[PDB]
């Protein structure tokens, strides 16, 4: 439980963290649960290096749909005003 | 609005159909497509080409709800406290 | 010494009612009412209205001190650029009475103050140095002058387009970041000048956008409905318990 | 087209009507002056904007593609305005 939170903790987000430094924190020494990270992440495998790409992660705008629902939200807004009325 | 204004709506785009078809003259020519282009400004179609009208939509009502949510503050303000206070005054000192 | 000055002028507020007749010290303690007064810098054109109520009195004196009289009043309107009393004073017939040598030249000061314009002011700046040195404070009265005619001349240039780069514009007043983009900061605290600049990219931006109009209108009172409910709340517990 | 898609960018003119970029400008202002569009140039990207338009004439393939795009604002707006009379309809009675 404290294993898979390298993963998850550590980013987002982050840019880059160094191989060993990830490694200080997993100890052994070059183990497959950082493989299978490199698998289940994905994320990336750096050489000597791993790296957030790309990037940092996914680039939300979010969305410029909820300019719909804004408009929901108004229909009973101004139903609400006609309750009273 | 919606009921009278898309039934010609659809009363015609089926007689324009059947020209084509049939009853051709009308050609007509040439104001059914003229001004249907000038109903072209905007479609509105798929999806509302509003990405500049966008923002502008929800501004247009930025107002219109803030003073929504004003003045029914203040309005009950006038509504719930005068209430209140001829309420008692009549209800508590008779009896 | 202003302190030492106005306490021989308070002396003079009892003198002068003192005897029969000044017969003449009132007019002259308008005179000195308009030295220390105008140190203390209280109004430009009360301070230069003494001056005229002075050179009414100045009438059929010593010559010697009514040739120099000019010299104070008239420079005194190079000071004010605004006494609106310009044409009042030196246009009337007591005021063209003096033919002399020394108001002829005062008589142009009189017009220099019409005058103004930095190309000019800068010029007969020279010329008229030796009245310059007649100043009472030769700082002072040229400070205000090149201090406010300085956004006299920025006006001009900020005004046709909106944004301007901020390294020509004060290029034109020599220098941008010691003083003068300080000074222009303060015009910002003063109203005179809304805007922004940019110091990276050396852009000056005008704004006059951002009203005050609905909010204050609202929130402002409720503040004072805040009063209605607490004075009620009086009415509230007294009935009820 | 249906647009809009109503700003146009020069190098969609410099194909269609083939013209060298420093010549779009007496190309889309002269028609300003025909009046066949009213539509105002951006010259920062150097996009072309297109104001109101000029139908001319129609053709077999334009009321089948009318039908398509006219219709589609018939049916769209009135499945819509049924949401408007269902729920708005008990607080007027």
């Known amino acids: 439980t404290i294993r898979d939170e390298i993963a998850g903790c550590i980013e987002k987000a982050y840019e880059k963290i160094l191989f060993t430094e990830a490694t200080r924190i997993l100890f052994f020494n070059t183990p497959k649960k950082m493989t299978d990270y490199a698998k289940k992440r994905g994320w990336v495998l750096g050489p000597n290096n791993y790296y957030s790409?790309?990037?940092?992660?996914?680039?939300?705008?979010?969305?410029?749909?909820?300019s719909t629902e804004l408009a929901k939200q108004v229909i009973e807004y101004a139903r609400q005003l006609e309750m009273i009325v | 609005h919606g009921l009278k204004g898309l039934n010609s709506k659809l009363l015609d785009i089926r007689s324009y159909l059947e020209?084509?078809?049939?009853?051709?003259?009308?050609?007509?020519?040439?104001?059914?497509?003229?001004?249907?282009?000038?109903?072209?400004?905007?479609?509105?179609?798929?999806?509302?080409?509003?990405?500049?009208?966008?923002?502008?939509?929800?501004?247009?009502?930025?107002?219109?709800?803030?003073?929504?949510?004003?003045?029914?503050?203040?309005?009950?303000?006038?509504?719930?406290?005068?209430?209140?206070?001829?309420?008692?005054?009549?209800?508590?000192?008779?009896? | 010494?202003?302190?030492?000055?106005?306490?021989?002028?308070?002396?003079?507020?009892?003198?002068?009612?003192?005897?029969?007749?000044?017969?003449?010290?009132?007019?002259?303690?308008?005179?000195?009412?308009?030295?220390?007064?105008?140190?203390?810098?209280?109004?430009?054109?009360?301070?230069?209205?003494?001056?005229?109520?002075?050179?009414?009195?100045?009438?059929?004196?010593?010559?010697?001190?009514?040739?120099?009289?000019?010299?104070?009043?008239?420079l005194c309107k190079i000071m004010l650029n605004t006494p609106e009393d310009v044409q009042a004073l030196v246009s009337g017939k007591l005021a063209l009475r003096y033919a002399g040598r020394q108001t002829e030249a005062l008589k142009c000061?009189?017009?220099?103050?019409?005058?103004?314009?930095?190309?000019?002011?800068?010029?007969?700046?020279?010329?008229?140095?030796?009245?310059?040195?007649?100043?009472?404070?030769?700082?002072?009265?040229?400070?205000?002058?090149?201090?406010?005619?300085?956004?006299?001349?920025?006006?001009?240039?900020?005004?046709?387009?909106?944004?301007?780069?901020?390294?020509?514009?004060?290029?034109?007043?020599?220098?941008?970041?010691?003083?003068?983009?300080?000074?222009?900061?303060?015009?910002?605290?003063?109203?005179?000048?809304?805007?922004?600049?940019?110091?990276?990219?050396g852009v000056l931006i005008i704004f006059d956008e951002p009203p005050v109009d609905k909010t204050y209108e609202a929130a402002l009172e409720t503040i004072q409905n805040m009063s209605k409910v607490v004075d009620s709340l009086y009415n509230k517990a007294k009935k009820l318990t | 087209?249906?647009?809009?898609?109503?700003?146009?960018?020069?190098?969609?003119?410099?194909?269609?009507?083939?013209?060298?970029?420093?010549?779009?400008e007496l190309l889309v202002m002269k028609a300003l002056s025909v009046g066949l569009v009213k539509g105002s140039i951006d010259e920062v990207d150097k996009r072309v904007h297109m104001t109101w338009v000029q139908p001319r004439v129609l053709d077999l393939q334009q009321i089948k593609g009318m039908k398509d795009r006219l219709e589609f604002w018939c049916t769209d707006v009135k499945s819509?305005?049924?949401?408007?009379?269902?729920?708005?309809?008990?607080?007027l009675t």
């Open chain 1, 53 to 66: 790409f790309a990037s940092q992660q996914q680039k939300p705008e979010d969305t410029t749909i909820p």
């Open chain 2, 19 to 95: 020209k084509v078809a049939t009853g051709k003259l009308p050609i007509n020519h040439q104001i059914i497509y003229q001004l249907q282009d000038v109903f072209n400004l905007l479609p509105d179609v798929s999806l509302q080409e509003f990405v500049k009208a966008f923002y502008l939509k929800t501004n247009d009502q930025m107002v219109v709800v803030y003073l929504a949510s004003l003045i029914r503050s203040v309005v009950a303000l006038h509504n719930l406290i005068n209430n209140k206070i001829a309420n008692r005054d009549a209800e508590k000192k008779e009896g």
């Open chain 3, 1 to 74: 010494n202003l302190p030492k000055a106005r306490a021989a002028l308070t002396s003079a507020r009892t003198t002068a009612n003192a005897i029969y007749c000044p017969p003449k010290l009132q007019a002259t303690l308008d005179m000195q009412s308009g030295i220390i007064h105008a140190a203390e810098e209280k109004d430009w054109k009360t301070a230069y209205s003494y001056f005229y109520e002075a050179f009414e009195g100045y009438d059929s004196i010593d010559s010697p001190k009514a040739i120099t009289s000019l010299k104070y009043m008239l």
């Open chain 3, 109 to 201: 000061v009189a017009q220099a103050s019409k005058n103004r314009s930095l190309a000019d002011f800068e010029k007969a700046l020279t010329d008229y140095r030796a009245e310059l040195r007649d100043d009472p404070i030769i700082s002072t009265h040229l400070a205000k002058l090149y201090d406010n005619l300085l956004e006299q001349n920025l006006i001009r240039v900020i005004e046709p387009f909106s944004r301007v780069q901020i390294e020509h514009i004060s290029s034109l007043i020599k220098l941008s970041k010691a003083d003068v983009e300080r000074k222009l900061s303060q015009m910002i605290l003063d109203k005179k000048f809304h805007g922004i600049l940019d110091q990276g990219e």
């Open chain 4, 1 to 24: 087209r249906p647009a809009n898609h109503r700003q146009l960018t020069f190098e969609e003119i410099a194909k269609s009507a083939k013209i060298t970029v420093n010549e779009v």
């Open chain 4, 80 to 91: 819509m305005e049924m949401l408007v009379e269902h729920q708005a309809h008990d607080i």
